[PDB]
Amino acid sequence: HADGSFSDEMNTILDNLAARDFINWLIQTKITD
Structure with missing residues (x-):
C-alpha cells in the first residue's frame, strides 16, 4: 500500500x-483467453 498526496x-x-x-x-477473453 502507499500513503500521501504524490506518494499514492x-x-x-x-x-x-x-x-x-x-x-x-x-x-481478448473469448478470442484469446
Missing part, C-alpha cells in the same frame, strides 16, 4: 498499462 501516484505507472489491460481484456 507512485503506482500510477501501472494505472496506464492496467487501464488498457482491463478494457482490452474484454476483447
Whole structure:
C-alpha cells in the first residue's frame, strides 16, 4: 500500500498499462483467453 498526496501516484505507472489491460481484456477473453 502507499500513503500521501504524490506518494499514492507512485503506482500510477501501472494505472496506464492496467487501464488498457482491463478494457482490452474484454476483447481478448473469448478470442484469446
